[PDB]
Design a protein around this ligand. Sequence first.
Ligand code: SF4
Ligand code: SF4
Ligand code: F3S
Ligand code: F3S
Ligand SMILES: [Mg+2]
Ligand SMILES: [Mg+2]
Lengths: 268, 268, 551, 551
Amino acid sequence: PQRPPVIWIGAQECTGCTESLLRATHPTVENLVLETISLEYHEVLSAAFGHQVEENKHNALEKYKGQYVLVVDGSIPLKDNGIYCMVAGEPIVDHIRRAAEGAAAIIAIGSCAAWGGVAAAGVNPTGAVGLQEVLPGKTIINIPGCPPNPHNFLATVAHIITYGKPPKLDAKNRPTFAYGRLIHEHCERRPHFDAGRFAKEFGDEGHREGWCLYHLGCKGPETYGNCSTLQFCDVGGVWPVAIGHPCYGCNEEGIGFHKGIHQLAHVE
Amino acid sequence: PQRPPVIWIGAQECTGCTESLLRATHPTVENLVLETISLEYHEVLSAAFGHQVEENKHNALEKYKGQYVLVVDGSIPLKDNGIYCMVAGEPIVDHIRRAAEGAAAIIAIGSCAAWGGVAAAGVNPTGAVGLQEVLPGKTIINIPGCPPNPHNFLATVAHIITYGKPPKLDAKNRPTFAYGRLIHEHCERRPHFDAGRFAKEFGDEGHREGWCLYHLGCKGPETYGNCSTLQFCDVGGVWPVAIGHPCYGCNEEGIGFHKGIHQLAHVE
Amino acid sequence: SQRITIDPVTRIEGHLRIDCEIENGVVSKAWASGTMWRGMEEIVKNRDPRDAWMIVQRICGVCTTTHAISSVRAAESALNIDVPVNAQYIRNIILAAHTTHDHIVHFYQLSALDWVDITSALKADPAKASAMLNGVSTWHLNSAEEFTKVQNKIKDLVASGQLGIFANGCWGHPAMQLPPEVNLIAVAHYLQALECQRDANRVVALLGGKTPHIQNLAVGGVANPINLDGLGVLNLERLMYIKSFIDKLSDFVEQVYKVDTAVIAAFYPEWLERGQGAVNYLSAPEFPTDGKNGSFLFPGGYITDADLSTYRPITSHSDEYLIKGIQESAKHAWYKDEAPQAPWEGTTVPDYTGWSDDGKYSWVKAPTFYGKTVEVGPLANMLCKLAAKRESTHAKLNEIVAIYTKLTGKTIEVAQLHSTLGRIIGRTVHCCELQNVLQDQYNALIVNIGKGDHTTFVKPDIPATGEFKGVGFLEAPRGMLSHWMVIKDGIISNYQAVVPSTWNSGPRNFNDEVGPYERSLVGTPIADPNKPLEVVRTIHSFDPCMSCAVH
Amino acid sequence: SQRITIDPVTRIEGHLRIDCEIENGVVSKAWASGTMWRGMEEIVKNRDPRDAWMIVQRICGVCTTTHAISSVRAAESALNIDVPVNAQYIRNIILAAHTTHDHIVHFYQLSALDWVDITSALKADPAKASAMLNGVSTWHLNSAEEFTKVQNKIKDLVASGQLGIFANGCWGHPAMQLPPEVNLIAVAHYLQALECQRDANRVVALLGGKTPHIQNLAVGGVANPINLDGLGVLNLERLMYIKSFIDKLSDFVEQVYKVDTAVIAAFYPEWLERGQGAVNYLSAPEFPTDGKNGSFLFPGGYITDADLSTYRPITSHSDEYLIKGIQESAKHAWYKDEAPQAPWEGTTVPDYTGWSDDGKYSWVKAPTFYGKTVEVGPLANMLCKLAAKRESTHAKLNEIVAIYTKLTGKTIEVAQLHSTLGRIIGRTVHCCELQNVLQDQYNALIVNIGKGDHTTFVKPDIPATGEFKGVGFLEAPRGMLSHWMVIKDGIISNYQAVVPSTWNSGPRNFNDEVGPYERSLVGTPIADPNKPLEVVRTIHSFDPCMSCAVH
Ligand code: SF4
Ligand code: SF4
Ligand code: F3S
Ligand code: F3S
Ligand SMILES: [Mg+2]
Ligand SMILES: [Mg+2]
């Protein structure tokens, strides 16, 4: 059988979202590219470089027109006519809008593409914005996180492939299976919260008893995600709060990279 | 280099506790038996049978007198002078009392050996009792559950080997690292419990949103264990309530095998 | 007439005692004895019918899942419940994946060291061992370098003088016939099997909530909440995880386990010529795929007089012919009531009198089917499938025989399947065919969810008054299992389990006919009555489980 | 005369453009351009010093962990914090396990397809390929059967007509010199590598809380709670789990990765004679093992004139000699202030001017050490360790050389290490030695916890007024990393990162000396100017990361 085509474009990315694929187990990255999809364009992995790699994109854009899913990784810098991210001599926005026109679906992977992320934080030096702002006439599937659990992305494209449509989305176009609930509304330390059992400093008695981390600045109460349940890396018991550190709100616009680590959830 | 000796005795067991070792990953069984300990006696796995294997037991008992950890798996039937469990023509209670005399440490693995478990429930046809009742005046480490996560046992043994003493125990002699807290006081559905979001029947709306299982009979409120955190099988996200079914209380005496699945727990 | 006792028989589940009379170097008569009893049937009595499965699952943790599913099937039968098809898909996947772990562990961990000498493996040339597999298997872990690493682990084990559970095995026994090289091959495969069986149990865990002892069932269906778009429930992401482990099983089963089965046979051809347990065989059909508890993927039935032409198919778990024939007798077991009992009217009143060759000598009841003693298990289910002309089973058996032929120049007739090795071959065939039920049922579950069906549960209506009888059949790793529930006024008034190792390990019945284990031992040659490897070999072929047999 | 542009350079992290002038089929002059900028330095400005590490970790996700640890080390420097030794053990285990994953992925996933032709692998004889490795490696996954499975997967991929990431690569290019069999070998190892790197990251995950982007650090130590007897925290069970994955790393590293480095060298001997990037080398010492931020397992230092005898050891991250030498210049980069700046006084104000051969042409600053340009990374760290007469490094290098000599009968002198293959060799040696770092620190951690020390965090005292300067060094996978933080009145007034790929990919500096990528390319032969594989080969040897270089 012919495998569904995927075109991946990195803008202002740290490559964390690609790297997440390397931790995946269902599918593993090798099974992904050899069995479940055809990764037609991805600069981190591609044998071809320079002129040959751009040949590959234009070839895939035409051959698989109307059929590929377009994945954008990273924020898009709008300041100074797009010059803060230039590949093959053109602004990344240009590459992205051209690809978007032939796309069967469009996924913004990571908080940066989803809503600007870290690169759009603070004074936002480059005028970085999220994918939806760049592609306003198109519906964009947002899969935020810095980076998300890779399966939030993989199961989303699997749904499209297996069932011929995107998974159910919330108001911010995030798949409900991964982002439908606040981390706090499904967190295993909530009883400690209820009881007022709080860690005050790392290494204190409470902390060493696995108590709630609200007062270390946990942002679980205002961050939508599946970090407490799906967690990370498929080994069991691995997410930031479980290893001893508060949620930073990396999934969530206005929270991650805006609020201080130790700033409380109820403090703006 | 010499590996610490372990003698494993099965009384009224279902072999689930031995089987739990086959799911283990740190260490895997083969690493356990080749590298970590020397398993001096275990009927399910021993190459030798009958007279040969009883000789093996006798040899190890005197050779490693004062050094082996004794693991007992299963309840011990005291009714009718011990005849409901006979190996090599003798009551298992006798084998157990003999092996306990030269033990460096004694471990009751599984709820049966820890407090009587399933075999002692209802009318208790065989007068089955736990290891502590059979061995008064001996310190017994209880690792309850039916079966427990094998690492509840493995990390207990490893603590003994590495640090020369048992791990910290609670009032019922259960290791605090695995049994120190109610499941309900560290459960990820607690926010749903707090809010009044309950599954009322398998397959209903709440159930299919992963809401709290209290009203389906979850015994989380009255059982100590690490099922919600360590969970099972090291693949991530796998314990009974995560897959959609109430805790039954299999760890806790007077709970599992006594209360109905759908009977409600007392909440502290 | 020399008398030997083997107690305990190791590398089985639970507590088995085997006695033999030996005359002229050959066992002439045998006794099988289950030496531990718990009274599990009495323990579940007087509870809500919904509670039984969680309790009665604890009959055994080797064949975990098995009593659990048979228990809910029995309650469902009593209450006339049609199981939601999604719930069948889920039960099927769990059963098949569990059984793949079960069979692999039985062949390697429980059985291999009957036929394999580890001290001989020390003498092997790894390069020679690897080379003799060329064109025999495509397995990627048969290199000389793999075999050397395995060999060094054994060398190191030996060097420590702590052989542990490998100590004092039957190394050097005259009945050990493998060359040093294939001994090493088998040890390497023994170790590889542990990885495969763990993957099988990862599939079980993701649906069951853990294993040993799943916790995802209910009378009425399963407790898995199907919702592709739900957080914390059975969504596409979890389904993909389950599939990922299903895909890892087949290669080992096809390229190692299937191949080792024919190799063992090639070096032990007379074991195709002894070990016959019975002339009658029963299996239940298994893996229902409709919304009415039927449409099984695997057929079952009844064969008599070792004659496949007598095959009577059984295609329904409600077959009255099947239901009405089953009885158990305690004439030679330590129970009070001795006449044959239909399980719905069964009793289990302990009556220990100690050992008597002519009287009572086991805690195992002796089942019959319309008075006949029958062997159950993978040989029985293979024979039924063959007689049903199931092409898949013939094709799979023939694959094994072809390997045997390539190695020996000989073939294997259906007549030689009535033996210690045929029984082992039936189990390997079963394991191979289950890989396709895993693929099939996963895909069916995926497509059904796609059609919009997320139903997993039907709520049982248990009337507060009246009497209801139900029987749950299941074709377990070790054979046809059945749970028999009587409900009176909303509670369990009677509960009886008739378990496959009950059929096989049962003592002499009401007319003094020996059970399959006992029959299979007659004619077993004995080179050394102090080290009766040959009886342990035949007994293991039945995959004994004594917590199952006795409960 | 002839000018080519490679844009994008592929199989690296981030956005890199490389221009070359070609004379007589040989590149005569080169330009390296980082073409994407985010301004991560300005983004962290004006925040609590404790916030920095979570934010600047996002400079890069390929070399995750690195910017995080350097950032806390800089704040700790500013505040004179002695890091609890337990936090050191944990930081070290994370760094070493991450770097294992990182190097593996660089050799195979990022670099191998420069040297390996997949279409030639299809033509290979699997048995011949497997036989070639007899006596060369003891790896258990080099069987002809393994290689057949791999070949079939490539075969199926090409057959489908969707080559994906393998489409339109340099297949059949004249610089491809491996025979079919070695191509197949490398592809098999490429696939096997993916498992090993996953195992390395599971170590990282269990301590960091996830990867990419760990979340267990603090200014003052780590957020892991050590308590052997506690539920939900870092107990003995979690520690055993970590160890289980640590133990799974060394075999692939020693028996596969280390071996392949030599066989690539065997078929590409000239690549020991081109690609030299510099005559000066810098590395920081790494893996502190005491409670005063010192006692490093790995030594650092500075070498000039490609002469190991000039080696000036650096054994403290507080060494003023190291701190005083470092400056950066944007004379030829897209920033306003052009004169060399010390990082504490560093500025980063964008001045994009477009491309100019003689002017500005990159977002990467050009760093210098006492005015000199210097190569950083595994070649640098290996040379320093060799100059330090570190026995482990010489022995590990010698193991690689011996395999090469076994294959070629030739040898490799330290002079030949100043090259594209020498740089690759340095990376392999680093990965190899790091496996002993993992074991050492795991054990040190276990023994320290058993002494009763469970301290992991010292709270920082951050004065609400006053100025404080700190620098955090870290020997990253791609070379010496430094984060420079100025605190003024409780908040960050300046923040500058000088990243290893900044050193290597830097444009012409204030004295117009070219950067290491730029120098390395001069003299590279080009068989086809439209497909400059040879350039890509030398550039990849530096393991470029442009998010890192530019931030
Ligand atoms: S840790 Fe964070 S998410 Fe979990 S309960 Fe406390 S505050 Fe809520
Ligand atoms: S009742 Fe059971 S499910 Fe609900 S919160 Fe307590 S433990 Fe979790
Ligand atoms: S910081 Fe991010 S990864 Fe999850 S735990 Fe919080 S949303
Ligand atoms: S039934 Fe048992 S396994 Fe844990 S979830 Fe409840 S204690
Ligand atoms: Mg019964
Ligand atoms: Mg900088």
